[PDB]
Design a protein around this ligand. Sequence first.
Ligand code: U1H
Length: 330
Amino acid sequence: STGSATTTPIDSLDDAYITPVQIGTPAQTLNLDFDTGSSDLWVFSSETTASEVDGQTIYTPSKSTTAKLLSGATWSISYGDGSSSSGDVYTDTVSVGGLTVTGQAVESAKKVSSSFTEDSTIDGLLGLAFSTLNTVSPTQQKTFFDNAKASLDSPVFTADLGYHAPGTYNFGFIDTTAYTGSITYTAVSTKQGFWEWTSTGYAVGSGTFKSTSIDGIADTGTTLLYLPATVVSAYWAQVSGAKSSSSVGGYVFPCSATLPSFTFGVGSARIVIPGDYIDFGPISTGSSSCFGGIQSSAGIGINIFGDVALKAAFVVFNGATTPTLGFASK
Ligand SMILES: NCc1ccc(C(F)(F)F)cc1
């Protein structure tokens, strides 16, 4: 079997991408943020604290004839940005673009942090990292992909994120019309539960390629590209007026600048991120200081190939016995 669903940026900056997901019987459609950086499928629900819901679509397990309370199960998760959520668990039928998983753990939120309440467009998250990161206690639960894997035509999912445009999440098949050239596959370490891999280096604009190993995660749930301070300083040194600002919390640059591209290595292959992808607009409404899409990973403790990098490529998350990542230009 296969699945195919369109993913759409939540706003004009591509801060995040939402993908419609059907939960329960009759179907309840919620727009979830597909996140390869986490492994919990959680949703705003009829159990979420009323003052913490502001425009989100909720899942009401009492209206689903297939919903079952997963007795005694709770979940609690904290994300890299400081956001968090927690609640109880139901099992229910969940489908993504035609692909159905019966008995999928649907973590119903009882509490959500302010960042989630403020994002009226995001009804929850659908984790796609390894199930080892799943927070359901006392019985750890599998991701949607892990549960669908055996039934898929090929044990893969692909991320084809658009730049200020819709894109596609495919499950179980590789669309050979969605990319140019060939897909370059690279090794993955699952030791930290992420799609963790090693980039072979970088270039800034038309500069010479620097061969250097950059360990990092392919994370659809992270907006920006977080790389080592050396790499990020080399990039921003090419933009007149660019600087790191502690008051803003990162590199900012004059909104009047035309940014250089950023190339990242995938084995002997190169993925070019166009300069316009690196512009995250004014730091505040009406400001002439723009926020950079390439930031330092120094405070995080891991490099993150977020949406800025992933949207420049057709990306294969190969969940075979030996998992790999494939990258192709598009
Ligand atoms: N990396 C996961 C993630 C995704 C979205 C959000 C936000 F911004 F919607 F709250 C936080 C954390």
